[PDB]
Structures are given as structure tokens and as C-alpha cells.
RNA sequence: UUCAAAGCGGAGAGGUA
């Protein structure tokens, strides 16, 4: 995905607080990057078979975390969000960014009552 | 949307028969004169 | 110039014309043409928005 | 001739209508 989509952010005392994206994509390819290397040396297959199942992992959760085996935990216990969790729920792109949006020229306020107004009047501060 | 005089109500005046009285108005003078209608009501009302 | 007196002239536009969404439409794009004819520095009568011309104008046509 | 330095994502808890 372009990295416009997965940015990085500062927090207020310096420190980053990267995508979730970001995590997926480097193990993904630090695993990927392992598997050749290994497969270049001519390595005893017992070992390229668990790279390659540990590759498999890696790409399922990479797209949908937690459906098939064992959902992957970060820096707490909570889980990841993955490419499918973007749009999918209730919080996801389609009900929360194409549906409804928010707006420019808007305000919010208190109502109180206002008699000697006609109908199709109203009172702005 | 006139012409319609109306009928001196000599009676106790509700819920319902304002209710009445509203319809009434809608239904034989239109949208603008019902508006007028109800906010000398009010005005009364609340005086 | 009373607000009544155009709440009553836009319920007289809303009549006699069978459809409710095809007077909408009429009324913009007379107030878009009447305020960009009036691009001529001569400020023909400028006071009145494009809106309330229109609704007028086409009441008074109505005849 | 050039703009420009103030905006950031997530999680938990509570409240108003």
C-alpha cells in the first residue's frame, strides 16, 4: 500500500507511534528475506520446510489476522489490525468515512426557548 | 384557498378541538394561513 | 417587502405547477442568470438576493 | 519570484441529552 496510508506519527515527547501495517509488512519480508538466503546456502530441507510453513503464517496474518490459526499480538496483548479489519466493521471505511463524513461551515450549541420569534425564525448568536 | 367563513365555536376549547381547528384551516385555506393561524393562537395562549 | 408576503408568494409558485421538484430547479436557474446578468457596473437594484428576485419576478408573471 | 509552520493515531474510564 502507498505509505501516505500507513503514516508515521510523533507523539508529544518524541517518540513514534507507528502503523500496525508497518509491523506485518517486516515481518513478512524479514521471513521472506531468511527463506532465500537459506535456500541459496543449499540448506537440509527439515529446515526449509519450517521457514516455509513460517512464511505462510506470516502472509495469512498479514491479511486476515486470526481467522485461520492464532491471532498475533504486538507490543501488548491486544491484537493487530490487519488489511480486512480496515473495512469490514461497524468502525471500518465504509460505515465511517463514505456514509457520513464530517463537515466545514458547521457549529454546535445550547438551545434555550424563544417566544415573539415567528415560525421559520430562529435566534443565532 | 378562501372563502370559507368560520363557524363561532360556542363552546369549551381542548386539545382536541384545537386540533380540529388546525386541520380545518389546512384543509380549506392552505399552507401559509395556518402558520398565521397558530402562532396568534399561541400568542393568546401564552397571554 | 414583508417575509410573509414572499412566504405567501412561494406557496402561490408551489400551485399551479403539477410538479413540486421541477419549480425548484426553474427558480435557481433564474437566479443564477439574473445575478450574472447583472455583472454590468450599474448595481440594478443589488439590495434584493438572486433568490427572492426570482420568486418575485415569476409571481408577477404569474399575472 | 518561493511557503509555511501547526496539525496529527490507538486503548481504557466516566459523563450529558
Redesign the pocket.
Known amino acids: 500500500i502507498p505509505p501516505d496510508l500507513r503514516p508515521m506519527?510523533?507523539?508529544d515527547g518524541g517518540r513514534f507511534?507507528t502503523?500496525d501495517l508497518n509491523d506485518l509488512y517486516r515481518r513478512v519480508i524479514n521471513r521472506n528475506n531468511r527463506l532465500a538466503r537459506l535456500q541459496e546456502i543449499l540448506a537440509p530441507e527439515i529446515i526449509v520446510r519450517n521457514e516455509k510453513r513460517m512464511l505462510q503464517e506470516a502472509v495469512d496474518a498479514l491479511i486476515d489476522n486470526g481467522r485461520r490459526g492464532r491471532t498475533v499480538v504486538g507490543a501488548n496483548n491486544?491484537p493487530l489490525?490487519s488489511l480486512s479489519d480496515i473495512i469490514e466493521g461497524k468502525?471500518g471505511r465504509f460505515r465511517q468515512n463514505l456514509l457520513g463524513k464530517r463537515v466545514d461551515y458547521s457549529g454546535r450549541s445550547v438551545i434555550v426557548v424563544g417566544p415573539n420569534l415567528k415560525i421559520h425564525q430562529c435566534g443565532l448568536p | 384557498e378562501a372563502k370559507s367563513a368560520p363557524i363561532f365555536r360556542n363552546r369549551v376549547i381542548d386539545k382536541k378541538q384545537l386540533k380540529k381547528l388546525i386541520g380545518w384551516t389546512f384543509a380549506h385555506y392552505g399552507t401559509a394561513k395556518t402558520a398565521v393561524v397558530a402562532d396568534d393562537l399561541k400568542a393568546l395562549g401564552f397571554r | 417587502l414583508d417575509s410573509q408576503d414572499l412566504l405567501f408568494k412561494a406557496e402561490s409558485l408551489i400551485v399551479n405547477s403539477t410538479n413540486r421538484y421541477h419549480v425548484t430547479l426553474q427558480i435557481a436557474r433564474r437566479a443564477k442568470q439574473a445575478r450574472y446578468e447583472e455583472m454590468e457596473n450599474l448595481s440594478e437594484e443589488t439590495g434584493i438576493k438572486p433568490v427572492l428576485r426570482a420568486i418575485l419576478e415569476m409571481s408577477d408573471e404569474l399575472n
Open positions: 506519527v510523533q507523539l507511534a502503523s491486544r489490525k468502525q
